[PDB]
Scaffold this active site. Structure first.
Site, short mmCIF file in Angstrom:
data_model
loop_
_atom_site.label_atom_id
_atom_site.label_comp_id
_atom_site.label_asym_id
_atom_site.label_seq_id
_atom_site.Cartn_x
_atom_site.Cartn_y
_atom_site.Cartn_z
N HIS A 71 17.35 -22.86 -6.24
CA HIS A 71 16.07 -22.51 -6.49
C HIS A 71 15.45 -21.71 -5.12
O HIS A 71 14.25 -22.09 -4.69
CB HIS A 71 15.23 -23.75 -6.87
N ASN A 77 19.79 -21.87 -16.40
CA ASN A 77 18.63 -21.65 -17.44
C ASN A 77 17.65 -20.52 -16.92
O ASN A 77 17.07 -19.89 -17.67
CB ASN A 77 17.81 -23.04 -17.99
N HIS A 78 17.49 -20.35 -15.42
CA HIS A 78 16.71 -19.45 -15.00
C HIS A 78 17.32 -18.21 -14.65
O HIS A 78 16.61 -17.15 -14.35
CB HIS A 78 16.17 -19.99 -13.30
N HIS A 134 25.57 -26.24 -16.56
CA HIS A 134 24.43 -26.46 -15.99
C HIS A 134 23.63 -27.56 -16.50
O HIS A 134 23.51 -28.64 -16.04
CB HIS A 134 23.65 -24.96 -15.87
FE LIG Z 1 17.81 -25.65 -14.43
#
Ligand SMILES: [Fe+3]
Ligand SMILES: [Ca+2]
Ligand SMILES: [Ca+2]
Ligand SMILES: [Ca+2]
Ligand SMILES: [Ca+2]
Lengths: 40, 145, 357
Positions: free
Chosen positions: C79, C137-138, C186
């Site tokens: 992130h 997912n990002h 993930h």
């Molecule tokens: Fe995620």
């Protein structure tokens, strides 16, 4: 035949807290359930 | 428009407590509605055009006149640029941007956090490498993206 | 000569050239990259696009389900915390002598996502057989334009770098088979994936759709009461994410027992201690589900520890680590002129409003 599990811990995080924004002055915008992320 | 000059003369006269033809900062701070305002001193410095520490009636009209609806976008951005440019050298340096922002933010940001965003602002907006932001560099970021 | 604060480093303006980053054999110099990126130093746009393309070429060759053998370090969601990524590599071992398997979510949230992408893509080029990057997912076009990653590329570099990442994320593999024991995804499982060949049959080279097993690979989450279920419904609608499914403890155990696996390593969900080993499977004796989270102090407010998983010598060593100082950024990468100009226009107006009365 399972493997062995060992946890190697550490000390607590040391970070800086942003001072509370006085709305009278020039304040910084805010950023935005607590476990999962955010839906599309 | 000579009508506006006569009308603003009365308001300039009431603000003049000692009747010296000029307006000092303490005479401005007599207004209770100007106490909670970090940019009163900057406007006083912009209106003053000699360094007497005071705004005379000719400096008063010259400064206030830039805020009427009759004025292009360059007039308004001229005053806005002069907010940060303290020494009036035509450019905004790193300190002049850190100092003025320090007034508006008060204590919502620490010095180490305010300086970081100041440098990265100039770094991504100094198309010449002089270490400062010019009026054209100041306009290329304001107004639009 | 007009800088009030010297306690913070002045970021360099010299964009790294193609000769300072790449050597004479086409190998990126990660030492010059780390030292420059940590100083908040930018690269030349031609170099930033070159690292993305040459890395995506290696990612496009790789399969949907990777074969990784121990010893290998398994990382969680980063992130965009580049300055915590530097401590992750020191905890999990240097990439020059240690295998790595990342489980996606390298962008968004943290305001150093492009620094994370350029450094992880440069290690992927320098170590194309020992370091592996999976998709989260990002790593798509929908979330990045909504979670300030597109803004991060447009402010630091250009929108062309953002377009190159949207084509590089499409090459990221979906899952990985670690040591023929653990399935590393993930999000989690899918109601449309019974065997590992179902993972191989998917066409990952696309934007993740809202349905199908490809969406569930990256978006699904375990049940809130994983292991203590009211029902036996294997997959229910994930009401928190708005898409994909909730997989249960009987669902994972049936999947582990059908394909003869041990556990399922995943990320996609934040943990207070950086990890979470869920209920043991009755037919294995090992935790059926293991969440890994590699982002310490998530969003600079969570004050959570982050853990990495170093599987070596038949030992699963969950090694935790705390955060590291990172430079400050205004929300959505806003400059100080845009931030202060409304305050300048308002308070100055209030002055003349009361001065002229
Ligand atoms: Fe995620
Ligand atoms: Ca006076
Ligand atoms: Ca004067
Ligand atoms: Ca100046
Ligand atoms: Ca300049």
């Amino acid at each position: 035949k399972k493997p062995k599990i060992i946890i190697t811990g550490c000390e607590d995080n040391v970070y800086e807290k942003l001072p509370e924004q006085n709305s009278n002055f020039l304040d910084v915008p805010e950023i935005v359930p607590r476990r999962r992320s955010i839906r599309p | 428009d000579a009508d506006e000059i006569k009308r603003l003369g009365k308001r300039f006269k009431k603000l003049d407590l000692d009747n010296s033809g000029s307006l000092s900062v303490e005479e401005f701070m007599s207004l209770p509605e100007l106490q909670q305002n970090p940019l009163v001193q900057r406007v006083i410095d912009i209106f003053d055009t000699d360094g007497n520490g005071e705004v005379d009636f000719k400096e008063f009209i010259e400064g206030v006149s830039q805020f009427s609806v009759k004025g292009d976008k360059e007039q308004k951005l001229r005053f806005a640029f002069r907010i940060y440019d303290m020494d009036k050298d035509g450019y905004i340096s790193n300190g002049e941007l850190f100092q003025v922002l320090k007034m508006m933010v008060g204590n919502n940001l620490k010095d180490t956090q305010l300086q970081q965003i100041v440098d990265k602002t100039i770094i991504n907006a100094d198309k010449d490498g002089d270490g400062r932001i010019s009026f054209e560099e100041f306009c290329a970021v304001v107004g639009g993206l | 000569t007009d800088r009030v604060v010297k306690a913070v480093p002045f970021p360099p303006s010299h964009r790294l050239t193609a000769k300072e980053v790449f050597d004479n054999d086409g190998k990126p110099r990660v030492d010059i990259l780390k030292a420059h990126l940590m100083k908040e130093g930018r690269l030349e746009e031609s170099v930033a696009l070159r690292i993305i393309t040459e890395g995506a070429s290696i990612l496009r060759q790789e399969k949907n389900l990777l074969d990784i053998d121990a010893p290998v370090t398994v990382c969680g969601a980063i992130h965009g915390q580049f300055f915590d990524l530097m401590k992750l590599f020191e905890v999990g071992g240097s990439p020059a002598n240690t295998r790595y398997l990342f489980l996606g979510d390298y962008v968004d949230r943290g305001y150093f996502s492009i620094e994370c992408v350029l450094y992880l893509w440069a290690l992927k080029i320098l170590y194309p057989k020992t370091l592996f990057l999976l998709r989260g997912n990002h790593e798509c076009r929908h979330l990045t334009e909504y979670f300030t990653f597109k803004q991060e590329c447009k402010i630091k570099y250009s929108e062309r770098v953002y377009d190159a990442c949207m084509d590089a994320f499409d090459c990221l593999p979906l899952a990985a088979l670690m040591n023929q024991q653990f399935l590393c995804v993930h999000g989690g499982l899918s109601p449309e994936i019974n065997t590992l060949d179902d993972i191989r049959k998917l066409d990952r080279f696309k934007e993740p759709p809202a349905y199908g097993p490809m969406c569930d690979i990256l978006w699904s989450d375990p049940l809130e009461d994983f292991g203590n279920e009211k029902t036996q419904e294997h997959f229910t609608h994930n009401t928190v994410r708005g898409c994909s499914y909730f997989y249960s403890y009987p669902a994972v155990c049936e999947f582990l027992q059908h394909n003869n696996l041990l556990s399922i390593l995943r990320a996609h969900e934040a943990q207070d201690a950086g990890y979470r080993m869920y209920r043991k499977s009755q037919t294995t004796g090992f935790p059926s589900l293991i969440t890994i989270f590699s982002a310490p102090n998530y969003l600079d407010v969570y004050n959570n520890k982050a853990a990495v998983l170093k599987y070596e010598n038949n030992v699963m060593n969950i090694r935790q680590f705390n955060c590291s100082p990172h430079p400050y950024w205004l929300p959505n990468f806003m400059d100080v002129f845009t931030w202060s100009l409304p305050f300048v226009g308002e308070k100055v107006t209030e002055m003349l409003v009361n001065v002229l009365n």
